[model samples]
Target chain A: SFHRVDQKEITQLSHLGQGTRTNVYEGRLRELRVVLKVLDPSHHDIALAFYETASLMSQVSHTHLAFVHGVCVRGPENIMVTEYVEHGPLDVWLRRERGHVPMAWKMVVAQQLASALSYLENKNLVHGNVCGRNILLARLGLSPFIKLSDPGVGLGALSREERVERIPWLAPECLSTAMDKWGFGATLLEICFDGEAPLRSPSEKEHFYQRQHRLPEPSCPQLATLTSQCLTYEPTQRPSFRTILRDLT
Target chain B: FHRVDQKEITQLSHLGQGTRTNVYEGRLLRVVLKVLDPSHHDIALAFYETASLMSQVSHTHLAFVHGVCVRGPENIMVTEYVEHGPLDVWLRRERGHVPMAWKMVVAQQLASALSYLENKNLVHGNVCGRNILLARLGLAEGTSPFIKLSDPGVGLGALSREERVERIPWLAPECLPSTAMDKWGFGATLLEICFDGEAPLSPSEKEHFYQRQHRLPEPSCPQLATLTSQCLTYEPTQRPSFRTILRDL
Candidate 1:
């Protein structure tokens, strides 16, 4: 088990974000700002997974990964504590819409995400829920640090319909990531589009590309090739995160 | 600023019955709703100072104080709940088969948290096994079993000493229960961990001072046994600081 948080320690957990089933909050965990996820369901299986995932994240300590403080079960709710990502999700950050981000920033973000995913894979874990929406940007250094958060477990608990709704952001790996199959390239495609949904199927991709044809490429050509490898038709054809990381480096 | 109304949360199981508060499952399973003991005239209201105190520090080993509900007449303290339940229960359930390394971890983590709190001049009035909740293992994998200390000294400040939880083996003699009360309790908790969760089985209702010295059996680890002896010493002024205990562990 990870660090245990007592009930009276968290303060100022106000509304931060809401998922289909979970509510995200900006709160103080022992005075340090943090992002807390409170699951909104009562299935026995979800509770079991909640504990399992929290334990899993506690073991992981990566530069690109957000630090998970631990989980609390004192309330009927199970609250998970992680480092505060001040800038929040990469897909909807205020800066993402402000202006063009430098190419170097995009490269770093890609490299960081790949490294984090590789780390998870090495642990026999999967970042099954790796879409732009789930990725957090912690404005850490000159370039923002990436946090591949809300691992597959939470997504694993989602209903089939919920998964279908986010299918554009999800990869073939989601089915297995829930059981061990999750995605990376489709996730790369997400970064390439700055969070715009990519081709769900051939027809869908054609429509998206045709509609946003005027938008500037999210990454340079070199990064584009890597993104292509991740979005290949055969999910198994996608390059491993290790390879993606090497290419970025 | 998640305004929690009695209506917003659906009450679930009552976790525990403490001296002044009633803890229950609420909202989502992620949070526990703590209502004042309605039957007791001395309802403890959470103060800004205590809230400020809890809000000032964040540590991996501490319980996160989420929020306070005072907008209505109900003085509710919303805290992050730990699912693994209390340390005493965990130890009893495991019959102390938990590895020696884990006990070391449990002791070390608690000491580390206490040392942090002590540095801030915060007194932990509740540091017993009952107050020690086993942390869910989600922050990371393969990490040692972790524990969190409930706010022993926290909300108790709002009440008179007589109104506080009982002053038994956890509380030292000759002093008003305060931070030092925690030191003695910490010793008791550590000894309980060392003794395979066998706390001084009964805190004895016989007398204010009972012949309880025989209850503590010597441990395989003599250093810890010696430490317990020091903690049980009647001389309250001689109680060693948890900082010293952390150093020893």
Candidate 2:
């Protein structure tokens, strides 16, 4: 068995972020700093899950998605090591800045994120969970670069029973058996509205908000109508991620 | 326009061994340090001739061998920084790693570069991506990850002004026109990039290397398999140029 570093061995730089499935720790590996995800074995088949996710992410070489370096499995504990994002998750950063976050900045991040998502969609893959928590922000000079993380464990090709339970930031179509484009619209809403979760609070309250046809305003008023069309409850009626990306641009 | 750094100059890192010349990294830039075979007049002419033809090619995509640097009277003139390792190394890194979309983007970049060379009325004697290097790498990060670098000018085309060189193995058999030669090389490069360094064909054991040279093996990439086959056509005249390939991709 490999020597597992104790908690003291890793100097905790800061609490990066967390989700139902994993807690993220920002620390150092040798001299280079890295982000490590401690998975919840109860919810995820850690070994199988990381292997598939790494396999998929490793294949994709793009600017937006977080690059998976490799995976580490030691005894019962499993960890996924990926390129560390110094700025941390997009949601927390956006929340801190809140009203100060510029519209242009939001647009740039949105465009890059959309491009990455569109790339995945073309390959018949859906990022089942698209939320602020999953989007890591890395600063490249003056601009911020977004990296999509934690994919391949939910929806798409995976069985429903195998899927990890997630908060409802995703479009309604994701819940149903049939594949649809509502998920993209929800993601678009989060991007444009400073990572605001449309459906919030007690699970029932969030579900009610989604049912009311509540949608995000477009980046501009011109695109507002298109955003509404994408948020339609009926999966078939929703526009594709490709169309959304094009219209957003 | 820029002074070559002498103080920061490091000894050339030996690139893989070549027949006519020993390639090395020069100064801080990845200049193709070709030490000509002083004993053979024909080999020296080949190196000088390639440098001359490179001088004539004024396109951004074409490898621009900087001013011939003569160190005393012994070492041959050092070519300008092309800034990359060969395409074979790049494809190896991309194996099972690159996604289809990114591969398309690379194909586009190569096509644009090839088109620029075609516009100059110059045939990239070697049409493969191995020759294309990332300009920035040549200028600054010479020892960093190999990006796109142009190739050393060679082939039968360099032999005589009237005689066009065709790497028959990579050439279109129909018509050995300058344009056709360029197109075939471009296609082969694309195939190499897409297939993760796998050769188009595995020559039969019965056939000698020369006899089986033109034959393409099975392509690892589904999309590239068909495209490489088309580009590897025996007829050079009917081959598609960079323009057509760019449009098709």
Candidate 3:
């Protein structure tokens, strides 16, 4: 029931990143390059999260979402195998290759992100944390698509402590008790503004804007005000994912 | 790119019935099951409906509709294996035995599924507790338990324009005009899932309620209230698409 993604079977390409629980390695499995997140022995939760994310991902089949290949628990650590995104995270890519992302491309990426978010909302949940780091840019032939990654904080009913620790992009209400619409609005800002946070950090000058219930300026003014309206801080006031879809289309 | 799911590979276990096809358990390399609809003999459209709906999707995260089997007069549809009972039914089962963590796992599965749907510019068309199936967790032991199952309502779009009229009860306002009923259906479905299939109006009294209320029940999930309400809006231009739903969610 277990298959070892041996070192020989895959050539280490590069290092992706490291979290408290695991180290992600970029490598090739057969002909395909994949990101293999290897969990540390001390980080039992990382292994659990990897497995949970993989199993959850395996059930999904969509263009905008990342493709999970398989899970390898061989040796001392557990590893999750997923498609390799050569274009890198949308934010970094968009910033590094600013003009290269293009207006149409941004809209396309926004649409892709919006669509993915809609899917999550339909299920009565939120990504909790949506940003460029968790979004990958990839090419499907000549067309580029956005792929969502990382489910570390997704799903599950978080306690006050857990919510505070995990959901960084969530609206203030999310930390108090129940989830609100502002969470989605914040994420929408990230996608449209090339990974910008909807509200600045507490230490930033714009922190007052956040307190005043101010929304982010439109990254795509031509798209529609409703697109940015998703960034509203009040969950009650924010539009639903479906509404965003209608506005975008 | 495709494989035929033979009768031997498909083992049908009845999952009861509602207004559409009676569900069943599918066992294959992937989730493979049959849809036993009464129109198998007389309706060619019924057999092709699932295919048409699934064909629009090309994401790895989506549940793939492999192929339809209408041998002689028997009509059957094949799909990927999505273990576990529907979300509403499973939630009922978990009311006592399941832990909060397990419920979170189910929520995660739903989020992932919705994420894929949003990316595809498509809606589940029928989102609700009964339509979302939770995959069996811990079936093989030492694994987390849960998976979200999506039932898109007997592939309504697969039928001819004439056949679509019969499914008006599940439709949204804009769908009544133009033939773009999928959007309305998607909102209604999401509401059902959040509310555990208890529409503002009960299933038996849906017609009476629709005649008076002129819209579906508002969504109960605090986080999704605004998005759900927008989904039920009367104007097609105002109703959100799956992409917008993702942003709000």
Candidate 4:
């Protein structure tokens, strides 16, 4: 069920990150520490989109995805209370670890993401935005498990420049017409090198080799092949989430 | 440790099960989400007084109602998770050896909560052994014990007399909607506590309330026997108010 969060009940804290339409902040709800994604009320479209996200959350419950407590429809601001994930984003964690990330750990996170995407697909839904930034890591056992979050908030509401800036996260089709596959492939490459986005040079931000399926060589040949299958030029040829999960785990 | 998953939120125990509702324990955040069948008419008074109590009842002796979520398919009430489970289980497990003073504490806590309800012009139509929550785990060096009654007026609202028999053993002699019934049920609960876990009356023949009351032996301790007699007085008019019981305790 969705929560009508009261402002007094929440204590908004540190800045976590900024998305195209929302800014995440660390906060305390009653006694619990949570992540708050605040949307500008001026953008009524994005504000209303929170209700859609909340509706989807109520229908589906899963482990490898952020748990949204509910959305607040109070006053000036639009706030979303989601599960506070520590260890932050996968990209940042991978960057800090650099060469230390094991291939086994990478597979676990990838499998978890595929499982989440598959669950979404079963509901006839696509995670319009699938990227490293939306993947959260929380350690429950000796090692951390990853979860996919910020699903279905497609790029339709954002400006052209905003969409262009987030090219690495999207597929060849700007609106992610090909569903979760291509976007998932872009994220898989980021995981392959532990943190780095596939680019000719980090400083220039030239991105990976062109549209067809051409990609910078991955350290592992198996991952290189899988990533290519994911980024197939013909959208119909891309493997389903189930097949991807089969090879991933 | 920080972000507890649904798996971490294990079902430690099933408290009770009815056709209309089922209760559970062991939510990660010291709370349980009790989902209800949204037929509306069956559980008429269950969440009614609870919604009222959330704002009105501020006493520590009452279990908290965090919020109710009825927007979803299954209506849910988020309630504070009481540690050490319910009274009946503890009474059965510990039997006579569970200190008499602890029984007195349970009596006093219920009296206090009921007295508050009485002051607010409300009657707890349901007051029995299973309804009270017990917390024996985290006791202080020299405290009697702790118990918290669920909200007043939170039970299957209206039912035929026949329907009441199987579910309610602690019901008073004149089982009417009047405040006197609440008093008698309170006494019955106290009697059960006094007897470790034995019901005040056998399930098969609860109609012989007075016949058994006078014939039965006194409770273990002098103070307990004395109070039990006063509580189980035949005439509803002669029975003591919760305020009087609280003052006596």
Candidate 5:
């Protein structure tokens, strides 16, 4: 009952977003409005991937993570339906608002992201993707909440060039706790810079191209300290999201 | 954690009541909560097995199980509520209006779901019309209602003698274990659909019929009438497998 979605009952609405081999749609399942993330048929062993992600997501739940409504494994479209979060992707709001956004709001977002990552860490699972683009922002009155979307669904279909665009945030291993830590740090940089790419700063950009995965000390001392530890070459040395959250508060 | 907070669910109304559970329509995820009676000694064990097994298998016709709530005194299994409710009730309400073609569609989909279970090596011990749920679809998708097979009866203890007799019309004459029992239930389900939820024979008649082995009453549709006859065959081995039934459909 948990993950078996009846596709016929689901009404697919307008397009929400798209990844390499996945398309997200604003949809309705029964009485609840939902976001349907559908996988493309071109991928190898797609059914296995879809079910694997559905199973994992069904087992895990967090206030800061998007709640999986269910999954439609049957044909027409194989989709992972999740709760529809209003206000859209976190990065979009940050980009559009720019200077209008408050620093405190960014910090709140960071803390929430860390909270979600800490939950995943406790479960011995890596998010694989942790950045503003994948994060969604929702509001309760004036208060902001983050809904971190699952990256395992269609992320495997990313082309080499698509993956390269995220090179600055990816750890050397690309799929581990260290990788997530590195991404968190890069995401922090993105938050501070109004959702700009982490590689926006010329100094760190040059260093990154030169094979040095280090960041220049930021003007903000607290962020500088956090980024330095998170971007450390050795994964063992990277700070845990638990530690990150404590320090942020 | 797959565990749901009991407080999060706002119980709407009672959907069904039984010795094992009182199923309630709930607000969370538009879910149906199957709250078990905590008095039974093996309630916890049965709940765990039922929940775990439900989470593993998914099909279009199977009621989508969301998760479970084992917090404090509550021992609840959460599943997606099919809007049209049980097939038997729907057939009775619609009676003469339900087209024979749609009835055949229901029979075919039921067989498809059973074949899916057979492939998964899972026996749905309960396969009567009462256990099958229906959902109405939009006109754009055509008139056929979606079928949802529910309550596989995993870990459920034997029913009382009176209850057994009440459901005897749906039980196989030699009601032995394995998938053959389900085939007999399928025939009963077909009879229920064709006769507007009526049992194939009365209790006394069922006993007499089992002894002498008379052919089942023919429905208007020759194809289904023939198929139902095959399913109701006295020898369990002679009864058709779900796969064969699906192929014939």
Candidate 6:
């Protein structure tokens, strides 16, 4: 049962990240470690958007999705409490352990990411943004796991520069489902390149994609074939999440 | 994205009827399914709006929703089925046999439930005895009773003017219902529980009482009467919030 958490119970340990209108903090909900994403009080109109994100995340339960502890829905500080990943964002994890991270482990993450997206697809929900940054990396014993963040929630609040940076991952045309496929491809490529950007610059990437160019072939042939199919020019030609997930396995 | 498949639900019987939805006893984990009325053309949006609101909230004294079935014509919302039925009916059945502890438990739990809504900046528009459902927690004669406050605005949204007038005994004098007015209604419900299901005031006397600023006669329970009186203050702003009342209890 999801419920409102008392703000006093959470101990903010460190600043984790921030969105356009939210500040994410590494925190503790009671004795349990958590990530508290709070709405910035300066933005008066963001309460509802923040609530939507909390509500959607709480309702949809998936192993690959971050577990929501609860939300503090009251004003001045609307906060969402989720499980804290010690390894942090997938991009950060990959960059930190670039030379030694095993291909098998990265492949496991790709499969888990596909599984998460497939679950969302079945629910008829669009994640909106899919990238290495929004995807989190965590460990259970010796095995790595994935936890995809809710990108659709505060997407509209993103600054212009932030939006431009997301260009390489966005689909050419916006059937959100197809956009996720393009994002998945870019993110997969990022994994192959140890969190490196798909293209050198946003403008250069924009031109490359404008000419219907796909990402450079991945070192892993199977991933290369899958990513190439996903980044196809025609949205309909792109593989559905279910098909992509099937092929990944 | 907490989507439920209709195929999994085996409808047992039509539980009740509502202006906006049809309540059915369902076998998908013994749930009460509230299907949106087919007469409404915009089924998906309306169901999503209501279900989204319901999904965010979780409380022991608030009905627990399993998931929602929105795929087909029957846009259904699934919630826990309280077997012991409504609080009003149970109060009538027990009458004078009901103990002070039981009444106090009811009042405290209801206040706790409303306090949660207050914490989330929400108001239960129809906070009356009839909207409260009970569940038997223990078999002993003096065991505490468990109750869940049903969705106040769900089925009650399209109530007729005549029906609204009938609820005047629970409404505050200036009640264009708000969170403060909810305190007034909570007082009325508490009074009903204390008085063995009798209304605090008759429907015929509501207008006269409102105009004259009349209040309920002091009830029998010393502590409860004091709290109820505070909640029933004629000045809406002066009424004690459920949070304050909960703390006192």
Question: Count of backbone clashes for each model?
Answer: 51, 24, 43, 0, 5, 0
TM-scores, one per candidate: 0.52, 0.46, 0.42, 0.47, 0.47, 0.47
As for TM-score, the candidate ahead, 1 or 2, is 1
lDDT of 5 by residue, B36-69 (tens): 8764546567566767877888788888777788
Cα error, candidate 2, residue B162 (Å): 22
Residue A175: error of model 4 in Å? Answer: 5.6
lDDT of 1 by residue, A48-159 (tens): 7777778878888888787888886655787887777655787785234434556666678878877888787677676556767677866534477777776634666777
The residue ranges of model 2 lying beyond 4 angstroms of the native Cα positions read: A1-73, A76-80, A84-249, B1-10, B28-32, B56-64, B71-84, B132-147, B154-168, B171-177, B201-214
Model 1 agreement with the true structure over B54-155: per-residue lDDT tens digits:
556788877766666664446666666776777777677556345666677888888899888878787766677777777652222233566776654235
Worst 10 residues of 5 chain A by lDDT: A152-161
Instruction: State the TM-score for model 1.
Output: 0.52
lDDT of 4: 0.68
> What lDDT tens digits, residue by residue, belong to model 2 across residues B1-249?
122333434557777544345667776444556554443455455556666666666654455565444343333435665534565665575456445655666667677767776676766555554565644221111112224435454334334322222233444433243666666666766766666765443323313333444465645567776667777665677677767777877
Summarize candidate 3's per-residue lDDT along A91-117 as a digit string, tens digits.
Answer: 665554543445666667667777877
For model 3, the docking class works out as incorrect
Off by over 4 Å in 5: A1-249, B137-141, B153-157, B202-216
Fraction of real interface contacts that model 6 preserves: 0.00
> First chain TM-score in every candidate?
0.81, 0.77, 0.73, 0.87, 0.87, 0.86
Arrange candidates, best lDDT first: 6, 5, 4, 1, 2, 3
Write candidate 6's Cα lDDT for B1-249 as tens digits.
Answer: 278887888777886764367788888747888777664544456456556666789888898777788665667778788977678877786566567777888888899999998888876767888778886533232235778987653433445445556677776666423678788889888888888887766555566676677778777778787888888888888987777898899
lDDT of each: 0.64, 0.57, 0.56, 0.68, 0.74, 0.74
- Which ranges in model 1 have alpha carbons more than 4 Å from their true place? A1-228, A234-243, B1-14, B25-30, B39-41, B45-53, B56-60, B71-73, B82-85, B119-121, B136-142, B153-167, B174-178, B202-215
Chain A TM-score (model 3): 0.73
Model 3, which residues run further than 4 Å from truth?
Answer: A1-11, A18-22, A40-46, A74-76, A99-101, A123-126, A140-143, A153-168, A176-184, A191-215, B1-249
lDDT of 2 at B217: 60
